[PDB]
């Protein structure tokens, strides 16, 4: 496989880890008894453990010799779920936040008191501006090609 | 009321509320969709 | 095995370096 | 002195000899030089890839080594031809 | 002046102790001395260089002498893998009988074991007897004396070189490239062919028989005839035992590739060929500049003509020629930078392509050398940026460099600084974040939820050169690749063996753990650079102090006003960057040591699994490998590691003492000193004695320097003890 | 000891001369400003380098600049 | 006052005081319990008395015993 | 042109408000070295919002 | 014998030399040419 | 320094277990007398040795302390 790794579904170390983990919890549960609230909790915990390992097994994750999942991020779409797809999520959300923030600052900049509106936010306006960020990619590009995003050497600079 | 709303509109207060909401929703997502290291 | 004479010869050489070093230092001063 | 402005450098930058050479001649030389370099590489490649018989580094030939130096010269000559052309000579 | 700082009236007329402190630290800034002309400056610097050279040679002479007079080189030569090399003897009147026995273990007298690698180097280059080492030391002592004479001679009235001589760039470069580097390499290949290689094969060639012992049976006939292939025939067999004729060959110049099977080091024949080739390249390159013979290039013209036609780089490099020739600081900066890169390369390539015999088997020495050169590299790098800033403040001419490539750099300074900042932030947040994620999940008992990225890009590069474990069938790792076909009959055979041997440091195997540490090192370089680069660009002025250039490279501050201007000088950037430099180098050195430690110990897995989270480093590296060191001396006795143990604690003290100067500032101390003065003047008997230099507190900048030095010395000393005691205590 | 220089951007606010802890600055007649006064540094031998003067200047960039230099008993504020 | 109130409440609804009271030598004092989110449950130790929680070290149990609390209603 | 209530861009490199816009308050006509008095909406590192500049250091923006 | 040199030189280099050097520096920095 | 003195002295010369008969086994074994007289002793017989718990707390209910130990250093 890529990098000499092995699929986790076919890695013995991965399975050994699972068995060991469950055993530890079960050994603890033995002390408590029957429907004792402590025992029921530990029992539920083993279920989650079994589920986690199963999910990873059914996945396309590749494990190493230690039996631990290793992520691939070279651009291959075979393992896009590991980095590329989640990556888009971050970019979309982050841009949303940044775009809306810039919009609000510029909007309140022309108000009676531009500094009071930064310490005491105008919630009504903020909410409106915040909702308009879902199309930030389009808006940003449009602003760039309209020479409204990047300024032109009319900004303060150092002495040298 | 108006004045109280202004206090509730102060930066510190709004941050706390927003972050509490954000933290909560993240926690809730993990409660119902737990243990994820990738989009499956 | 480095003989005593050999060691003594080395020491003599070092002395020359020392005296020539003082001069260079005093010339740079 | 060598400072220049515009879209093409002056001929003085090409040295004391090439600054007087015609653009076409330089072009001919450039193409020829590149050819020699490429030929040398291809031929040497066969030597390196021939079974045995290259022990003790027999694959290195004086002629091919000299020929391979045409490649860098090819670059210089082709650049110079352009400069001469723009300069009008 | 008529006081201690003869070169400064200002300091000389000072009524306090500052006169003494500053005079010592401003002694080598010859450019700022009272009444200094450019000619004198150059002349004095030239002479000072002769002195430095002499010191270096005296140092080398001492090592040879002490090894020869108090060492075990000859015994080591006989049994290299079973003898511990001796540096020098020990005569400390404070030692107790027990200590005399402990440090005298394995020998008959108290001694220090060397971790400098001199034995391996000398063994490889040809030295076999103590008498030989002695001759070398004596010769170097003589050379040192000659250099001292030169310094005096060129300061005399009729031998002082002119300022023009000092600025003839073409001749110096030609000479230095062709002679200092080129011919010297040719001379070295001569030594290797005449003395070293014969010794490796059991033959003794010295000053007694070198003129009658031909290096090769054929003679110089093949060379002049053109049949050079003869010198590469009959390479030493794979069964050759070093320092003996069993399985020896006759080849003197070859391109085998790889390592000698028995010594696990690069073949000597290959090194000889290497230096021969390098020689020709440099000798040819030294014929590029005009030097009173008509032919050649004029550097000024070359620089001036290089302006991209598009205008993207402004006026190009016009004006830089004069700036460099008339600025010693820029020259020094360029030099220090290049040397810094070289030092790092030496460290990186010397542990992979082992050059000396049986050096790989000496774990402690190998560890010391790497940490040594990497730390030196850091200091050299920081100095380069420092002198670059000094240049801008002192030697930069805004008018000469109009729209030059250099000036335009100072025009988009904000862009550079801001973007470097972003890079640092990105690397910092995610690297730390991922480490903490891995720590938390592991702590909660769920290691399967760790985010571990495989270093695929690096693995690919390793495969490209022939590594096969990663299974990336590419380039040299592919039998059908055109590249493999090319060198399969030249140097690949030997290389592909070493690269694919697990018991060598050639392209060590990498895993998810290496990914993270590499990104941490990246953070260090970027952040250290930010501090240094900002200091340089914002050295001639800023928004807070638009007139910084008129105050200099180093000034205390600009007052408590305009918000507060502490640490606003460029010198302070160096001060701040030093800490980051140490941190980054520390990370780099820790990584090398732990990785190798686990490999040497036979458990590579420990690093592979525990390096993913921070606790692993603290518990499985620092805590676990500190046991030998902290037990150098205990309530039950002591061993040879006692000196190393003591130094470890000593380092901690100096480091912490530094904190006092860094956190506590002058005001408090000055007031306290005043009270002490009152006491001395009012206490009978002591009143008889009085000072001639008013006692005052250390200055703002002085304290910063003192503190940085204490911090640095402690930092280096403590790690030095650990790297040595831990490695030696466990594997030696 | 230290060097104090006054520049043409002065406005004769007198704030600097009212802040000096050692009477180094004075207000002298001048015609370049509306106030008709400019600051001078007649007694720099008593400057301690406090820079309080600079902190008081109202001009965009200080019209009064103190450049620290040679140190004497007076400049080092030594009562002993 | 709110602080003290919380401590007593947490000792009434999230503690093993009753069990500890019966066997003070064996059972370990605990008055804080973590929610079962994200494997943080590991922090809930097997203190004793059929109870799992964080072992507190403020000394509340001892004080309450000296006062004579006995019950969790109090 | 520099005049009361006019808006100008500072051209003094040492100014905190270089390449920024300010409003000319009053221009003195008595021959003082720096006649114009410009006011800015942002405080400098010292906390001031005004400074006097010469006419050449100011370019009218409109 | 050269072997005795360690016990004859070290006392001088580490004690006598440093002392005289420090004394000279003091006299040099405390003098007003 | 004061709190460290308390911790080592007690664990070495007071705290511990005693058998039905008179056999006192202190937690650290009485190392304070001959080890606390040197700085190396404090670094080895106290900080290095008594820190084995935090560093090896991962995977247990005491894992929180390990994380906090690291966080505090940061
Ligand atoms: C400098 C490092 C670098 C960079 C920037 C990239 C960048 C990229 N790689 Mg990639 N790659 C690299 C090194 C790198 N690779 C190495 C060293 C390997 C070998 C292990 C690969 C193997 C690889 C594969 C197999 C694929 C990519 C793909 C891609 C692209 C992602 C698809 C897209 O639209 O975006 C992207 C341009 C994908 C691509 O081209 O999609 C069309 C794809 O399928 N890469
Ligand atoms: C003069 C001494 C000498 C000798 C005996 C060798 C011997 C060797 N060299 Mg070498 N080399 C030398 C000097 C020498 N080198 C110098 C000074 C340089 C720098 C220019 C080089 C650069 C060099 C390269 C770049 C290469 C070699 C290669 C070789 C090997 C095969 C070629 C051969 O034998 O010559 C054959 C040469 C001639 C018969 C005449 C050449 C005359 C020239 C062109 C003038 C062999 C081990 C090749 C090899 O095997 O490595 C992969 C290879 O690729 N050498
Ligand atoms: C052939 C004649 C010749 C030779 C041998 C030298 C030799 C020297 N000159 Mg020099 N000089 C010459 C002619 C010559 N000069 C002429 C004609 C002039 C007048 C124009 C001068 C003017 C001059 C001045 C003004 C000064 C010198 C100095 C020096 C000394 C430099 C210090 C030293 O020892 O470093 C030698 C160091 C080495 C041999 C080690 C080199 C290590 C490098 C890093 C190797 C790099 C290899 C490779 C590139 C790395 C690859 C990796 C890379 C990509 C990172 C050196 C002894 C300096 C000095 O100290 O004077 C006392 C000095 O200040 N020279
Ligand atoms: C070839 C290398 C080289 C050369 C020739 C110079 C030359 C120079 N540098 Mg420079 N520098 C270098 C490398 C070099 N540097 C490097 C590598 C760095 C990075 C650290 C710097 C950083 C640097 C700074 C930051 C400054 C200089 C300055 C100077 C100038 C004055 C130096 C001075 O006053 O020292 C006088 C003599 C001393 C300071 C004595 C040094 C005592 C040291 C600090 C303490 C010794 C260590 C300690 C005692 C060890 C004891 C430990 C023990 C207990 C075990 C001079 C032109 C200064 C300047 O203004 O130039 C314009 C300046 O401010 N340099
Ligand atoms: C442990 C000690 C420590 C740490 C962590 C830092 C951290 C930092 N230093 Mg620093 N520094 C230190 C000691 C330290 N310093 C010392 C001792 C000195 C004296 C020499 C300096 C001198 C120094 C200089 C001179 C400079 C820095 C700079 C920086 C920053 C570099 C950019 C970076 O890493 O961004 C990432 C930063 C961090 C990861 C640290 C903060 C992390 C917090 C906890 C946030 C974590 C968020 C997390 C990922 C999750 C976020 C989402 C969440 C809200 C839901 C960073 C904030 C540079 C700077 O200003 O940055 C551009 C700079 O120029 N430092
Ligand atoms: C010193 C006081 C103190 C402290 C530190 C704690 C701490 C704790 N209690 Mg506890 N408690 C206390 C007093 C205290 N309690 C008192 C006095 C009572 C009696 C009413 C209780 C009753 C109680 C119960 C019944 C429970 C706890 C639980 C808990 C744990 C979870 C806390 C929680 O709800 O997290 C989550 C936090 C929240 C859900 C609150 C939401 C966050 C808010 C919205 C942020 C604040 C908004 C901000 C102030 C806006 C400002 C507006 C402006 C006007 C000021 C935690 C260890 C729980 C527990 O252990 O379960 C196992 C639990 O079930 N406690
Ligand atoms: C290389 C330098 C060096 C050398 C050779 C010594 C040697 C010695 N030290 Mg020592 N020491 C040094 C550096 C050195 N020290 C430093 C740097 C420190 C500071 C940390 C100390 C702190 C130190 C302490 C605290 C003590 C010693 C003691 C001793 C003595 C123990 C052996 C013995 O028989 O004692 C028995 C003593 C004798 C047999 C007497 C020997 C005759 C004396 C030394 C004659 C001295 C006359 C001398 C010429 C005067 C100097 C003149 C001046 C111009 C230099 C021994 C003579 C111990 C001692 O007893 O001191 C004498 C002691 O208590 N040392
Ligand atoms: C009118 C007339 O008469 O002609 C006309 C008509 C005609 C003919 C169509 C025209 C033309 C001519 C043209 C277009 C001519 C040339 C264009 C050209 C020639 C463009 C690039 C060469 C680049 C090279 C060689 C790059 C690198 C060479 C490199 C990078 C090397 O490293 C060489 C190498 O050596 C090293 C250092 C080591 C060696 O051991 C081996 C190798 C190989 C690795 C003109 C211009 O219209 C004029
Ligand atoms: C940027 C840069 O670096 O450019 C540099 C590159 C470089 C190379 C340094 C330069 C140079 C100098 C020159 C002139 C380089 C060119 C060529 C070079 C390298 C050297 C010259 C002649 C060699 C000859 C004549 C061969 C003798 C060889 C002879 C006579 C033989 O073949 C003997 C032999 O035949 C027998 C009798 C029988 C055969 O069985 C065995 C062989 C075949 C071996 C440049 C071009 O100036 C600038
Ligand atoms: C401050 C300043 C200064 C300084 C600067 C500096 C310090 C810089 C540095 C810089 C640096 C430090 C740089 C570096 C660089 C690097 C590089 C440039 C690299 C490259 C690479 C390449 C080109 C490639 C290679 C290769 C080959 C050959 C083949 C394939 C593979 C590879 C990768 C390997 C001065 C004084 C001047 C003055 C001004 C200012
Ligand atoms: C302790 C301390 C001092 C006082 C430290 C002093 C005075 C050091 C005094 C001892 C040193 C070792 C000098 C003693 C030199 C001897 C008297 C011998 C001198 C001989 C001459 C010929 C050199 C400061 O002046 C200071 C200033 C600014 C920030 C922090 C601090 C600070 O922390
Ligand atoms: S160094 Fe002193 S005067 Fe300058 S800003 Fe800092 S505290 Fe104020
Ligand atoms: S620095 Fe201090 S003493 Fe000097 S002029 Fe200003 S206020 Fe007066």
Automatic annotation (TrEMBL), chain A:
Coiled-coil positions: none
Alphabetic keyword roster: Chloroplast, Photosynthesis, Photosystem I, Plastid, Signal
Annotated Gene Ontology cellular component terms: photosystem I reaction center
Pfam families: PSI_PsaF
Binding site for chlorophyll a: 74
Disulphide linkage map: 8-63
Family matches, as PANTHER family: PHOTOSYSTEM I REACTION CENTER SUBUNIT III, CHLOROPLASTIC (PTHR34939:SF1)
Protein name: Photosystem I reaction center subunit III
Naturally occurring in which organism (per UniProt): Thalassiosira pseudonana
UniProtKB/TrEMBL annotation, chain D:
Residues that hold chlorophyll a according to the record: 59
Name this protein carries in UniProt: Uncharacterized protein
TM stretches of this protein: 24-42
Source organism of the structure: Thalassiosira pseudonana
Keywords of this entry: Membrane, Signal, Transmembrane, Transmembrane helix
Section of the entire sequence shown: 51 to 139 of 139
UniProtKB/TrEMBL annotation, chain H:
Annotated InterPro entries: Elect_transpt_acc-like_dom_sf, PSI_PsaE
GO biological process, one term: photosynthesis
SUPFAM superfamilies recorded: Electron transport accessory proteins
Subcellular location: Membrane
Keywords annotated in UniProt: Membrane, Photosynthesis, Photosystem I
Pfam families reported in the protein's UniProt record: PSI_PsaE (PF02427)
Gene Ontology CC entries for this record: photosystem I reaction center
UniProt similarity note: Belongs to the PsaE family.
Record's function text: Stabilizes the interaction between PsaC and the PSI core, assists the docking of the ferredoxin to PSI and interacts with ferredoxin-NADP oxidoreductase.
Family matches, as PANTHER family: PHOTOSYSTEM I REACTION CENTER SUBUNIT IV A, CHLOROPLASTIC-RELATED, PHOTOSYSTEM I SUBUNIT IV
Protein name as it appears in the record: PSAE, photosystem I reaction center subunit
Taxonomic source organism: Thalassiosira pseudonana
């Amino acid at each position: 496989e890529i990098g000499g790794l092995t699929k986790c579904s076919e890695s013995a170390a991965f399975t050994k880890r699972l068995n060991a983990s469950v055993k530890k919890l079960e050994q603890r549960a033995s002390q408590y008894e029957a429907d004792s609230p402590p025992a029921l909790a530990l029992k539920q915990q083993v279920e989650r453990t079994q589920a986690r390992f199963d999910k990873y097994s059914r996945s396309e994750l590749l494990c190493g010799a230690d039996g631990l999942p290793h992520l691939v991020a070279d651009g291959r779409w075979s393992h896009a779920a590991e980095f590329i797809l989640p990556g888009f999520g971050f970019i979309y959300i982050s841009g949303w936040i940044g775009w809306v923030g810039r919009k609000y600052l510029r909007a309140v900049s022309t108000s009676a008191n531009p500094s009071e509106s930064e310490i005491i936010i105008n919630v009504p306006l903020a909410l409106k501006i915040m909702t308009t960020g879902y199309i930030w990619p389009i808006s940003a590009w449009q602003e760039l090609i309209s020479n409204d995003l990047v300024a032109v050497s009319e900004e303060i600079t150092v002495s040298p | 009321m108006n004045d109280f709303q202004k206090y509730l509109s102060t930066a510190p207060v709004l941050l706390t509320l927003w972050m509490t909401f954000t933290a909560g929703f993240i926690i809730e997502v993990n409660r119902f969709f737990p243990d994820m290291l990738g989009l499956y | 095995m480095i003989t005593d004479f050999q060691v003594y010869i080395a020491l003599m050489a070092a002395l020359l370096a020392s005296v020539l070093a003082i001069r260079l230092g005093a010339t740079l001063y | 002195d060598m400072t220049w402005e515009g879209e093409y450098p002056p001929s003085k930058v090409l040295g004391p000899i090439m600054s007087k050479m015609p653009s076409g001649l330089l072009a001919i030389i450039s193409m020829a030089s590149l050819g020699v370099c490429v030929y040398s590489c291809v031929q040497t490649g066969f030597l390196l890839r021939e079974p045995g018989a290259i022990e003790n580094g027999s694959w290195v030939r004086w002629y091919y080594v000299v020929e391979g130096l045409g490649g860098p010269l090819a670059w210089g000559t082709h650049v110079a031809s352009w400069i001469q052309r723009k300069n009008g000579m | 002046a008529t006081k201690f700082p003869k070169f400064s009236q200002a300091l000389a007329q000072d009524p306090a102790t500052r006169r003494i402190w500053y005079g010592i630290a401003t002694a080598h800034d010859l450019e700022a001395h009272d009444g200094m002309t450019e000619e004198n400056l150059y002349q004095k610097i030239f002479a000072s260089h002769f002195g430095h050279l002499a010191i270096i040679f005296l140092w080398t002479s001492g090592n040879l002498f002490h090894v020869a007079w108090q060492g075990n080189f000859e015994k080591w030569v006989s049994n290299p893998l079973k003898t511990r090399p001796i540096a020098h003897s020990i005569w400390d009147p404070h030692f107790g009988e027990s200590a005399l026995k402990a440090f005298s273990k394995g020998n008959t007298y108290p001694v220090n074991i060397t971790f400098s690698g001199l034995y391996q180097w000398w063994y490889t280059i040809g030295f076999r007897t103590n008498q030989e080492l002695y001759k070398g030391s004596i010769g170097l002592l003589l050379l040192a004396s000659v250099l001292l004479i030169a310094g005096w001679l060129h300061l005399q009235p009729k031998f002082r070189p002119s300022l023009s001589w000092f600025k003839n760039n073409e001749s110096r470069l030609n000479h230095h490239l062709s002679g200092l580097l080129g011919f010297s390499s040719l001379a070295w290949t001569g030594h290797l062919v005449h003395v070293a290689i014969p010794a490796s094969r059991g033959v003794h060639v010295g000053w007694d028989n070198f003129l009658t012992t031909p290096p090769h049976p054929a003679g110089l006939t093949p060379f002049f005839t053109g049949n050079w292939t003869v010198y590469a025939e009959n390479p030493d067999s794979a069964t050759h035992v070093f320092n003996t004729s069993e399985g020896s060959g006759t080849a003197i110049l070859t391109f085998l590739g790889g390592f000698h099977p028995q010594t696990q080091s690069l073949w000597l024949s290959d090194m000889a060929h290497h230096h021969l080739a390098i020689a020709v390249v440099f000798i040819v390159a030294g014929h590029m500049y005009r030097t009173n013979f008509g032919i050649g290039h004029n550097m000024k013209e070359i620089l001036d003509a290089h302006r991209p036609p598009g205008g993207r780089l402004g006026a190009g490099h016009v004006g830089l020629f004069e700036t460099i020739t008339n600025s010693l600081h820029m020259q020094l900066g360029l030099a220090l930078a290049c040397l810094g890169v070289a030092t790092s390369l030496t460290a990186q390539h010397m542990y992979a392509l082992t050059p000396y015999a049986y050096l790989s088997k000496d774990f402690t020495t190998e560890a010391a050398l790497y940490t040594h050169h990497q730390y030196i590299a850091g200091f050299l790098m920081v100095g380069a940026f420092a002198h670059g800033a000094i240049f801008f403040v002192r030697d930069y001419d805004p008018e000469l460099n109009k729209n030059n490539v250099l000036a335009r750099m100072l025009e988009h300074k904000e862009a550079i600084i801001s973007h470097l900042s972003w890079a640092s932030l990105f690397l910092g947040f995610h690297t730390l974040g991922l480490y903490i994620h891995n720590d938390t999940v592991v702590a909660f008992g769920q290691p399967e939820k760790q985010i571990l990225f495989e270093p695929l890009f690096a693995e690919y590069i390793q495969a490209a050169s022939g590594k096969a474990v990663y299974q990336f069938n590419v380039l040299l790792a592919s039998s059908t690749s055109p590249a493999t076909a090319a060198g399969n009959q030249v140097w690949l055979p030997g290389w592909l063996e070493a690269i694919n041997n697990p018991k060598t440091d050639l392209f060590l195997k990498i895993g998810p753990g290496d990914f993270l540490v590499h990104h941490a090192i990246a953070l260090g370089l970027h952040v250290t650079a930010l501090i240094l680069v900002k200091g340089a660009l914002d050295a001639r002025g800023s928004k807070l102090m638009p007139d910084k250039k008129d105050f200099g490279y180093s000034f205390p501050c600009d007052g408590p006003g305009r918000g507060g201007t502490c640490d606003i000088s460029a010198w302070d950037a160096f001060y701040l960057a030093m800490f980051w430099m140490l941190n980054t180098i520390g990370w780099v050195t820790f990584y090398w040591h732990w990785k190798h430690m686990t490999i040497w110990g036979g458990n590579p897995g420990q690093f592979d699994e525990s390096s993913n989270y921070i606790m692993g480093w603290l518990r499985d590296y620092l805590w676990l490998n500190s046991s030998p060191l902290i037990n150098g001396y205990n309530p039950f006795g002591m061993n040879n590691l006692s000196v190393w143990s003591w130094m470890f604690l000593f380092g901690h003290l100096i480091w912490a003492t530094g904190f006092m100067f860094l956190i506590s500032w002058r005001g408090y101390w000055q007031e306290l000193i005043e009270t002490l003065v009152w006491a001395h003047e009012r206490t009978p008997l002591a009143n008889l004695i009085r000072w001639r230099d008013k006692p005052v507190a250390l200055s703002i900048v002085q304290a910063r320097l003192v503190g940085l030095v204490h911090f640095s010395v402690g930092y280096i000393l403590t790690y030095a003890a650990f790297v040595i005691a831990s490695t030696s205590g466990k594997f030696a | 000891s230290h060097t104090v220089k006054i520049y043409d951007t002065c406005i004769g606010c007198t704030q600097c001369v009212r802040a000096c802890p050692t009477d180094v600055l004075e207000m002298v007649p001048w015609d370049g400003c509306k106030s008709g006064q400019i600051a001078s540094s007649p007694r720099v031998e008593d400057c301690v380098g406090c820079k309080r003067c600079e902190t008081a200047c109202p001009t965009d960039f200080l019209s009064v600049r103190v450049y620290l230099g040679a140190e004497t008993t007076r400049s080092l504020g030594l009562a002993y | 006052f709110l602080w003290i109130s919380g401590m007593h409440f947490h000792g009434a609804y999230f503690s093993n005081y009753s069990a500890w009271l019966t066997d003070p030598i064996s059972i370990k004092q605990s008055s804080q319990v973590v929610w079962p989110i994200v494997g943080q449950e590991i922090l809930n130790a097997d203190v004793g008395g059929n109870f799992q929680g964080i072992q507190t070290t403020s000394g509340w149990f001892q004080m309450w015993r000296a006062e004579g609390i006995t019950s969790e209603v109090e | 042109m520099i005049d009361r209530n006019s808006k100008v861009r500072i051209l003094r490199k040492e100014s905190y408000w270089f390449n920024q816009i300010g409003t000319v308050a009053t221009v003195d006509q008595s021959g003082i070295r720096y006649p114009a008095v410009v006011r800015f909406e942002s405080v400098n590192y010292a906390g001031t919002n005004t400074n006097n500049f010469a006419l050449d250091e100011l370019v009218e923006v409109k | 014998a050269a072997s005795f040199l360690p016990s004859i030189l070290v006392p001088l280099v580490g004690l006598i030399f440093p002392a005289f050097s420090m004394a000279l520096f003091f006299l040099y920095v405390q003098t007003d040419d | 320094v004061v709190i460290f003195h308390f911790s080592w002295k007690m664990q070495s010369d007071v705290w511990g277990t005693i058998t039905p008969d008179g056999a006192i086994s202190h937690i650290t074994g009485g190392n304070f007398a001959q080890s606390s007289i040197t700085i190396n002793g404090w670094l080895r017989d106290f900080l290095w040795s008594q820190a084995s718990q935090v560093i090896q707390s991962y995977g247990s209910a005491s894992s929180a302390y390990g994380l906090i130990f690291l966080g505090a250093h940061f």
